[PDB]
């Protein structure tokens, strides 16, 4: 399965999705800079509308514990 095919379900907790992401990211062998680009970009983009909304409110500069606690009720 390709990294672009990794997406969050409509009922799937973000948490279970983030695990899937760094597992597939774990099978990507690209430069770190590209993998940083993938992190800030693709993760949020394939996140579900309800959490996506939430993550837009965190702004930039956000870290994984704060994202992970931010989308917990969703």
């Amino acid at each position: 399965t390709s990294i672009l095919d990794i997406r969050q379900g409509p009922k799937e907790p973000f948490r279970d999705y983030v695990d899937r992401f760094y597992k597939t990211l774990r099978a990507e062998q690209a430069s770190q800079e590209v993998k940083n680009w993938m992190t800030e970009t693709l993760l949020v983009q394939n996140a579900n509308p309800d959490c996506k909304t939430i993550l837009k409110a965190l702004g930039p500069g956000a870290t994984l514990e704060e994202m992970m606690t931010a989308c917990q009720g969703v």
Partner: protein
């Protein structure tokens, strides 16, 4: 493997059955998963080519992958021979012969020969050359076997 003895020399000692079985069990349980590569790397510490063919030959199952690996090992070996040409004139009495891709793959070399190269001064890391080919071929497999 070739290990250091108490006396302070490098001598060969055989690999252990519950090490062997641990190699088997990893493959049974985690198949093509990435954790197999660090795992391999730890269990291949101080290992010979001969021991590395033993580990590859003792696999059961996943024969499409085992063939892809073989063919990668030979390609990487063909590439060793290409990049490193044979050396000028006859082999010296005072010296031992340079390895080929097939000596690195363990095929054309004997154990005592594999111990000569590694224990001698300078030593040559024929394990680590095969190890990269194995890891490289492991990447090929992992990337393919991703679904």
């Amino acid at each position: 493997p070739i290990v250091q003895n108490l006396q302070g020399q490098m001598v060969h000692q055989a690999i252990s059955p519950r090490t062997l079985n641990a190699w088997v069990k990893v493959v049974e349980e985690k198949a093509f998963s990435p954790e197999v590569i660090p795992m391999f790397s730890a269990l291949s510490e101080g290992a010979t080519p001969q021991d590395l063919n033993t580990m590859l030959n003792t696999v059961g199952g996943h024969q499409a992958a085992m063939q892809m690996l073989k063919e990668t090992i030979n390609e990487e070996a063909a590439e060793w021979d290409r990049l490193h040409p044979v050396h000028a004139g006859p082999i010296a009495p005072g010296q031992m012969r340079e390895p080929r891709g097939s000596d690195i793959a363990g095929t054309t070399s004997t154990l005592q020969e594999q111990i000569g190269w590694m224990t001698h001064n300078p030593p040559i890391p024929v394990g680590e050359i095969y190890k990269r080919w194995i890891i490289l071929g492991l990447n090929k497999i992992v990337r393919m076997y991703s679904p």
